[PDB]
Amino acid sequence: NVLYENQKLIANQFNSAIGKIQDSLSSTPSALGKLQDVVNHNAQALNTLV
Amino acid sequence: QQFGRDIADTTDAVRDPQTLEILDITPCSFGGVSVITPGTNTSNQVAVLY
Numbered sequence: 001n002v003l004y005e006n007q008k009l010i011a012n013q014f015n016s017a018i019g020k021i022q023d024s025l026s027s028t029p030s031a032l033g034k035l036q037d038v039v040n041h042n043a044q045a046l047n048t049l050v
Numbered sequence: 051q052q053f054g055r056d057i058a059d060t061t062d063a064v065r066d067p068q069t070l071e072i073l074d075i076t077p078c079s080f081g082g083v084s085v086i087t088p089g090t091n092t093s094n095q096v097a098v099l100y
Binding site for chain 1: 057059060
């Protein structure tokens, strides 16, 4: 019963959170550590062989 | 400058002594060969993947 009495508030908060995370994934440059680290490890291990 | 090099410590650009124009170096077309086959109990034809 708590959802249907607060639907507009939940929708607004959800949209605000979506916009906030869309801005925050681009503002912080160190939020993508793992993928860059694994591709850099692969590149370094390939380069040291040559 | 006599000849160039790259990141991977390999020869890339070579200048001949006869002409001031420089010549690039790219190795011959190399790559693995793979076979695409169905079951030999089923058929006999194969397809070559380069």
